[PDB]
Structure 1
Amino acid sequence: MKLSDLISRWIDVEPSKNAQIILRDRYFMKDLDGNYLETKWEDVARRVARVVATAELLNPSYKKNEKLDRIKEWEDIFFRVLKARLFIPNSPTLFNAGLGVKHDLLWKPIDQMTLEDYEEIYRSRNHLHMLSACFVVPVGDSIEEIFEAVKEYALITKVGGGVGSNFSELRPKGSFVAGTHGKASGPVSFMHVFNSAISVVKQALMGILNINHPDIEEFIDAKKEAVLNFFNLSVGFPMDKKEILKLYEEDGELELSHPRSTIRKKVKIRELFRKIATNAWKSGDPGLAFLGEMNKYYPLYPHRKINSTNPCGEIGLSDYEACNLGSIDVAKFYNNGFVDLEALQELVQIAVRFLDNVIDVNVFPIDKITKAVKESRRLGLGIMGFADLLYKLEIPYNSQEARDFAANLMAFIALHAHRTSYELGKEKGNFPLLEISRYRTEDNFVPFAMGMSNYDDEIREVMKMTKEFRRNVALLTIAPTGSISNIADTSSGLEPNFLLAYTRFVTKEDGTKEPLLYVNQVLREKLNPEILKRIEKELIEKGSLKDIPDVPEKIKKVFVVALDIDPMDHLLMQDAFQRYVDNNISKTINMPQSATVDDVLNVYLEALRTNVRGITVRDGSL
């Protein structure tokens, strides 16, 4: 099916009442007075499409005699895909597109648009026109660098970004400070300042400490009993995952040390791991960040180095680098028992361009970030709706079938994303740092592990072609998609549905407040409406269909939720996707309440054997 046809099937389907609340709540633009400028998703799509299409002003392949034609064509395709809700960029794009721009230009009919109208939009983008979700800043070992970074956290947060740092540069607690004949506080104590800062710019953050830092144990325990309430915390592994797994298997020891300290200590790695697993088993923190694995696949490594992820972990970033995201709802690409690969390829094409255009209309609060992004042009195209896609295809999430499907789907998207990046480098110019990247200086560099798809050889072929032309350093991620999957009425990221049914309460102004039942749409349409009526009550009490009487087996096996899927099946699904993502992946390893700390440990060990770049894990713990 052509994309245009699929667009027609969805373009007049309106967001559900649930989505509309979220849109009214945070997305619809308002004036200084608090009046709505936007009252319909369509108005958001109009504005966003117009602003991002405006980047086509910069397109060197266009003749002035042609420019307004082209810009208008991109505006309409971007508009049509956003309105149909087939692709949605990360929230900051939808919040901030067109801030600074006269309200007369953002929503007026495209037929009325002039070249000078598009140029005025370009011109009038204010310092709040920040369209990217993901940021990393360094935090260097000095009072001056720490507080410059606290300021940067504040500035980035103001404009709607999420920021992470590796704090390992900071000398351990108790170490010698020259200026003071005193003693250093250490990273964990400086992270409270970043926490206090942000908790006031918000009337989540990423903090990483490397496994060999002398304060690592303190770090691991930092969120137990949480002073760092705005931080997600991951333990950083800058060495190879193989070395770490080997050291564990031999019951080896790790030396904790720091260059600007005389503080040295030997710890049993098994013991470090158990402490991390015990804390993660209790509270969910800290996760694991396989920084070495990220650098394995970083085209610019070792010239440039990935030290931290953004707050949700899906983008590994070098210092001052940012990254903009967007997601395709692949549940909408289901057609009679197959995924419509024809319409999907056309959309991957459009999406890569939309995302790459976001960089040109993006305004960042810090010059070093502007420069880092211009230089690399890193994107994060991903998917949402994948669980609902498996439901439609009648595939159990917790099956080798699902993971095989997932790796092929991702491999196909990867293929056509990187092909589009090739085409864009040819059309608009390569990312400045192409020449010094492994796409150039190597033969056979691929930014992911592959090994689970028929498309591998074709992918290799595209990667070789991008030695010449390449618009972007990296193109892909799977994000959490909390809100944008809500807007799109679909399941989040690559995550299974957490629940098939819950009560979402609607506030009658006025009246009082209504108990409104949600049942998963795909469940509603496959399950016999009279079975639904019966079990509906038990499903809400129990959270699964598995021990409900008189629901056919095939419905129980297909309509699995997060907690029906055991930890390894979660882990292996992450692996399947990561093999064909050049950035990282947002995946919660959900674990049953009855899981032990050893069960967590075993996930970590398995994690070290698979291709995952990071780990997040237990029901009932928080």
Structure 2
Amino acid sequence: MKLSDLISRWIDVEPSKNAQIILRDRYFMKDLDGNYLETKWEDVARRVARVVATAELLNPSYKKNEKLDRIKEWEDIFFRVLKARLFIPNSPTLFNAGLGVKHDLLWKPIDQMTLEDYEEIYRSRNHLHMLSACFVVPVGDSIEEIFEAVKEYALITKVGGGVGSNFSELRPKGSFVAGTHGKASGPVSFMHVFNSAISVVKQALMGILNINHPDIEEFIDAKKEAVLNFFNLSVGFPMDKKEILKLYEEDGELELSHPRSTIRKKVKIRELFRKIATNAWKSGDPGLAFLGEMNKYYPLYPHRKINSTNPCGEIGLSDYEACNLGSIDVAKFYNNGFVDLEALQELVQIAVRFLDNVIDVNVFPIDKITKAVKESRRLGLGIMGFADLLYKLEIPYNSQEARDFAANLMAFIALHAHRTSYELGKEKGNFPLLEISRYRTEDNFVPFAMGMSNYDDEIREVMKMTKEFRRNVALLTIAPTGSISNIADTSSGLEPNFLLAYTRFYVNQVLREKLNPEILKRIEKELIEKGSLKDIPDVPEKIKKVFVVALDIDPMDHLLMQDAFQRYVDNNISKTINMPQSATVDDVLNVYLEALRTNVRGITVYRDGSL
């Protein structure tokens, strides 16, 4: 089906009562007196479309002559997919597009727009016009750099960004400070100053410490039981995953050291791993960030380096880099037993241009960030609706069938997104750092593992073409989509449905269609208690096996789904490895070891009932 025809299928499907509540609550603009300037999703779609279309003002391919026509065309296409909720950008784009702009320019009808109208939108974007979810700032080993980072956290947090740092540069607790006296207090103590700052600004962060840091044990125990409540904590593994797996298998020792300290110590890697696992078992923190694996696929490494991710894991970013995200609802592409790939390719091309255009109309609080974004132009296109699509396709999330499907789907998306980036580099100009990247200096560089799709060879040649032309250093991610999937009335990112029937502060729509009412109306009671179909007798085996929820799916099937998607994603993936309440610490270690052998770039575990 053509995308315009898919759009006509979805454009007039109204957001649910639940979606409308969230939108009124957080998304619709209000005036200086709390009066609504927007009252429907279509108002949001119009403002967002128009502001992002404005980027086409800077398109060197257009003559001043056609610009108005071309702009209005892009506004029109952006508006239609958005109103149809086939693609939605990350929250900050929805909150903050048009901040600074005359109200009378933001919702005016497109046929009435003039070239001067777009120019004035472009020029009136203010300091709050911040449209990206993801940030990483360094924290250098000096009081000066530490507290400059604290200020950067406050400023990014204030404008609506989530920020992450690797704190490893900070010399360990007790290290000599060539001051008068006395001693360095170490990374963890300074992370409390970050927490306290953000707790007041927000009156959601990421903190990583590398496995070979001498204060790693204190770090692992840092949210145990003063927390640290605004931090997600991950242990960083800057070295090769293979190397750590070997060391664990051999019961080796890790040397803890720091370049600006005499503090040195040896620890058994197994002991340290177990300590990580025990705490994750108890409370879900800390996670694992496979930084080396991220740098393995980083086009700008080693002259730039990924040291941290954003709070949710899904983008590894170099220092001062930010990334804006957006997600395609794949559940809307179900068509009579198949994914309508015709319409999908069209949308992926549109989604990539929109995300790239967001960069040009984005305003950041810190010039170093403006600069890092301009040079790399990293994007984060992902998907949501995945689990709901599997229900429509009558495929069990816990099956090799689902994972082979997932991999081909992501490969197809990756192929058309990178092809779009080639196209946009031709039209608009390459990302400034193309010349020094592995797309250019290397042969056969591919920013992900592949190995589970028929599309590989096609991907490999598109990657070779991007030696010459390429708008973006990387393009793909899979985010949590915690709010935008609610707006889209669909499942979140790549996660299975957590529950089929609930009451968020609500019976799945696909289940409501496939399940005979009466079988439904009976069971909807004990579905809500119990939280699964599994042990409800007199529901058909076929419904049971397809309509699985997160805790129907064992930890290994969670991890293998993440691997299958990660093979064709150039940034990272947000995925929780749900574990049953009866899972032991050994079960958790086994997840870590399997994770080390797969292509996953990080791990988050959550044991049911643990918190």
State TM-score, norm by structure 2: 0.99
1:371-410, CA deviations, whole angstroms, 9 ceiling, x for partnerless residues? 0000000000000000000000000000000000000000
Which segment drifts farther, 28-37 or 426-435? Answer: 28-37
Instruction: Report the equivalent of 2:417.
Output: 417
When the two chains are superposed, the root-mean-square deviation of aligned CA atoms in Å is 0.6
Instruction: Report the equivalent of 2:497.
Output: 497
> What secondary structure, in the 3-state scheme, does the structure 1 residue paired with 2:568 have?
coil
**Does the C-alpha gap of structure 1 residues 504 and 223 become closer, same or farther in structure 2, counting only changes over 3 Å?**
closer
1:431-475, CA deviations, whole angstroms, 9 ceiling, x for partnerless residues? 000000000000100000000000000000000000000000000
Instruction: Report the equivalent of 2:402.
Output: 402
What is the alpha-carbon distance in structure 2 between the residues aligned to residue 497 and residue 146 of structure 1?
41
1:542-583, CA deviations, whole angstroms, 9 ceiling, x for partnerless residues? 000000010000100000000000000000000000000000
> What secondary structure, in the 3-state scheme, does the structure 2 residue paired with 1:415 have?
helix
- Tell whether 2:487 aligns with 1:487: yes
1:134-190, CA deviations, whole angstroms, 9 ceiling, x for partnerless residues? 000000000000000000000000000000000000000011111132011100000
- Tell whether 2:594 aligns with 1:603: no
What is the alpha-carbon distance in structure 2 between the residues aligned to residue 13 and residue 335 of structure 1?
17
Show structure 1 runs of 4+ deviating over 2 A: none
What is the alpha-carbon distance in structure 2 between the residues aligned to residue 226 and residue 117 of structure 1?
53
1:282-329, CA deviations, whole angstroms, 9 ceiling, x for partnerless residues? 000000000000000000000100000000000000000000000000
What is the alpha-carbon distance in structure 2 between the residues aligned to residue 180 and residue 278 of structure 1?
40
What is the alpha-carbon distance in structure 1 between the residues aligned to residue 251 and residue 63 of structure 2?
66
What is the alpha-carbon distance in structure 2 between the residues aligned to residue 436 and residue 181 of structure 1?
44
Q: Please report how far the alpha carbon of residue 479 of structure 1 lies from its aligned counterpart in structure 2 after TM superposition.
A: 0.1
What is the alpha-carbon distance in structure 1 between the residues aligned to residue 172 and residue 210 of structure 2?
12
> What secondary structure, in the 3-state scheme, does the structure 1 residue paired with 2:168 have?
coil
Which segment drifts farther, 52-61 or 176-185? Answer: 176-185
Q: Please report how far the alpha carbon of residue 58 of structure 1 lies from its aligned counterpart in structure 2 after TM superposition.
A: 0.1
1:7-40, CA deviations, whole angstroms, 9 ceiling, x for partnerless residues? 0000011000000010001000111111111000
> What secondary structure, in the 3-state scheme, does the structure 2 residue paired with 1:352 have?
helix
Q: Please report how far the alpha carbon of residue 207 of structure 1 lies from its aligned counterpart in structure 2 after TM superposition.
A: 0.1
1:395-426, CA deviations, whole angstroms, 9 ceiling, x for partnerless residues? 00000000000000000000000000000000
1:186-206, CA deviations, whole angstroms, 9 ceiling, x for partnerless residues? 000000000000011110100
**Does the C-alpha gap of structure 1 residues 449 and 504 become closer, same or farther in structure 2, counting only changes over 3 Å?**
closer
1:232-279, CA deviations, whole angstroms, 9 ceiling, x for partnerless residues? 000000000000000000000000000000000000000000000000
What is the alpha-carbon distance in structure 2 between the residues aligned to residue 259 and residue 333 of structure 1?
53
- Tell whether 2:605 aligns with 1:619: no
1:348-390, CA deviations, whole angstroms, 9 ceiling, x for partnerless residues? 0000000000000000000000000000000000000000000
> What secondary structure, in the 3-state scheme, does the structure 2 residue paired with 1:88 have?
strand
Q: Please report how far the alpha carbon of residue 503 of structure 1 lies from its aligned counterpart in structure 2 after TM superposition.
A: 3.1
- Tell whether 2:518 aligns with 1:530: yes
Alignment of 1:442-457 (within 5 A): 442-457=442-457
> What secondary structure, in the 3-state scheme, does the structure 2 residue paired with 1:616 have?
strand
Report the count of equivalent residues: 610
What is the alpha-carbon distance in structure 2 between the residues aligned to residue 409 and residue 179 of structure 1?
57
> What secondary structure, in the 3-state scheme, does the structure 1 residue paired with 2:579 have?
coil
> What secondary structure, in the 3-state scheme, does the structure 2 residue paired with 1:380 have?
strand
What is the alpha-carbon distance in structure 2 between the residues aligned to residue 227 and residue 251 of structure 1?
32
Q: Please report how far the alpha carbon of residue 502 of structure 1 lies from its aligned counterpart in structure 2 after TM superposition.
A: 1.1
Q: Please report how far the alpha carbon of residue 429 of structure 1 lies from its aligned counterpart in structure 2 after TM superposition.
A: 0.2
What is the alpha-carbon distance in structure 2 between the residues aligned to residue 382 and residue 575 of structure 1?
15
> What secondary structure, in the 3-state scheme, does the structure 2 residue paired with 1:180 have?
coil
Which segment drifts farther, 32-41 or 604-613? Answer: 32-41
What is the alpha-carbon distance in structure 1 between the residues aligned to residue 535 and residue 484 of structure 2?
32
What is the alpha-carbon distance in structure 2 between the residues aligned to residue 10 and residue 555 of structure 1?
26
What is the alpha-carbon distance in structure 2 between the residues aligned to residue 190 and residue 141 of structure 1?
11
> What secondary structure, in the 3-state scheme, does the structure 2 residue paired with 1:396 have?
coil
Q: Please report how far the alpha carbon of residue 226 of structure 1 lies from its aligned counterpart in structure 2 after TM superposition.
A: 5.2
What is the alpha-carbon distance in structure 1 between the residues aligned to residue 475 and residue 52 of structure 2?
18
> What secondary structure, in the 3-state scheme, does the structure 1 residue paired with 2:587 have?
helix
What is the alpha-carbon distance in structure 1 between the residues aligned to residue 141 and residue 32 of structure 2?
42
> What secondary structure, in the 3-state scheme, does the structure 2 residue paired with 1:493 have?
coil
Gapped regions of structure 2 (runs ≥ 5): none
What is the alpha-carbon distance in structure 2 between the residues aligned to residue 384 and residue 502 of structure 1?
19
Instruction: Report the equivalent of 1:512.
Output: none
What is the alpha-carbon distance in structure 2 between the residues aligned to residue 29 and residue 85 of structure 1?
19
What is the alpha-carbon distance in structure 2 between the residues aligned to residue 460 and residue 528 of structure 1?
46
What is the alpha-carbon distance in structure 2 between the residues aligned to residue 180 and residue 573 of structure 1?
54
State TM-score, norm by structure 1: 0.98
> What secondary structure, in the 3-state scheme, does the structure 2 residue paired with 1:181 have?
coil
> What secondary structure, in the 3-state scheme, does the structure 1 residue paired with 2:576 have?
coil
What is the alpha-carbon distance in structure 1 between the residues aligned to residue 32 and residue 374 of structure 2?
32
- Tell whether 2:300 aligns with 1:312: no
Instruction: Report the equivalent of 1:510.
Output: none
> What secondary structure, in the 3-state scheme, does the structure 2 residue paired with 1:65 have?
coil
What is the alpha-carbon distance in structure 2 between the residues aligned to residue 555 and residue 134 of structure 1?
39
What is the alpha-carbon distance in structure 2 between the residues aligned to residue 504 and residue 66 of structure 1?
48
What is the alpha-carbon distance in structure 1 between the residues aligned to residue 576 and residue 227 of structure 2?
23
Instruction: Report the equivalent of 1:561.
Output: 549
**Does the C-alpha gap of structure 1 residues 171 and 382 become closer, same or farther in structure 2, counting only changes over 3 Å?**
same
What is the alpha-carbon distance in structure 1 between the residues aligned to residue 200 and residue 32 of structure 2?
22
> What secondary structure, in the 3-state scheme, does the structure 1 residue paired with 2:18 have?
helix
What is the alpha-carbon distance in structure 1 between the residues aligned to residue 110 and residue 290 of structure 2?
47
What is the alpha-carbon distance in structure 1 between the residues aligned to residue 442 and residue 59 of structure 2?
29
What is the alpha-carbon distance in structure 2 between the residues aligned to residue 326 and residue 147 of structure 1?
32
What is the alpha-carbon distance in structure 1 between the residues aligned to residue 507 and residue 180 of structure 2?
63
Say which of 574, 582, 593 aligns to 1:594: 582
- Tell whether 2:568 aligns with 1:580: yes
1:79-125, CA deviations, whole angstroms, 9 ceiling, x for partnerless residues? 00000000000000000000000101000101110000000000000
What is the alpha-carbon distance in structure 2 between the residues aligned to residue 372 and residue 541 of structure 1?
50
> What secondary structure, in the 3-state scheme, does the structure 2 residue paired with 1:288 have?
strand
**Does the C-alpha gap of structure 1 residues 241 and 30 become closer, same or farther in structure 2, counting only changes over 3 Å?**
same
What is the alpha-carbon distance in structure 2 between the residues aligned to residue 142 and residue 572 of structure 1?
42
Gapped regions of structure 1 (runs ≥ 5): 506-517
Q: Please report how far the alpha carbon of residue 504 of structure 1 lies from its aligned counterpart in structure 2 after TM superposition.
A: 5.0
> What secondary structure, in the 3-state scheme, does the structure 2 residue paired with 1:615 have?
strand
